[PDB]
């Protein structure tokens, strides 16, 4: 709901992991460059 069940716990991890990937990609490119 809006208390904090297990799916909210799902949303949190999802959000951070996704957002964080494009920035990690620039760093992955630097190794190659």
């Amino acid at each position: 709901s809006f208390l904090g069940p297990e799916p909210e716990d799902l949303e949190d991890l999802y959000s951070r992991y996704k957002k964080l990937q494009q920035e990690l990609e620039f760093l992955e490119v630097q190794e190659e460059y």
């Binding site: 709901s1 809006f2 069940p5 297990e6 799916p7 909210e8 799902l10 949303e11 999802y14 959000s15 996704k18 957002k19 990937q21 494009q22």
Partner: protein, 273 residues
Amino acid sequence: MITSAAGIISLLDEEEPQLKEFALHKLNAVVNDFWAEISESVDKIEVLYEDEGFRSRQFAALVASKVFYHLGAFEESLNYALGAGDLFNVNDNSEYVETIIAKCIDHYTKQCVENADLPEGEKKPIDQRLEGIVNKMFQRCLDDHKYKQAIGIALETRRLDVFEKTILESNDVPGMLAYSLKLCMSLMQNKQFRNKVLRVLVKIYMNLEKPDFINVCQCLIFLDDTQAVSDILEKLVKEDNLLMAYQICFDLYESASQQFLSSVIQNLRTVGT
């Protein structure tokens, strides 16, 4: 205590239909210890899953899948499991066959990105068992009442199944738009999919009778669509609020150029004061 498989392999080999059928029930527990020796006999267990003279297929598919992942072929292991369509409840509850479940989610994502891109559905290449897993994930979101987790999986998978009108299956309608714009531009480098997500937001604004005011303005400038700005203006006639109107219009102006400026004024008169 027994450490050798040898007896089991012979039961499977023998001509007795009864012995062959029995073997699979006994096998599930051990085929994660004895498994190395059982690989020899991978062929007999596959025949029993194949052959419709048994309804031991379900049990057979599990044993046969189990030998395969151990062996180093993860894909064909999965493939047997999806075919019987053996329940995932059993695999989850065990710590042996964690392997297969892990491969199933990651296999699911490869199929889904290509299929999901333009059409609403996720198409035939993703069979009933994969969908069946996804459905379990789907229930959790609905319960939560929150669109953002639906949004988080839908971008990566590239689904439009749960990225559009998932408020008919119940999730949070307001607030949806902001999250969707900021993630999609940054993460995505596929234009075809990007455009879709943006086209969906034009439909989402309409559900609401006061949609978010920042979000319309991004769609207006990039797409060149008079349509994104238009739903918010349509709602405001019906609502009759000066305070509500002003914020949207100032947000729009900054982004907008002169070509946009001409086009909005016309829309606004049409809908009404």
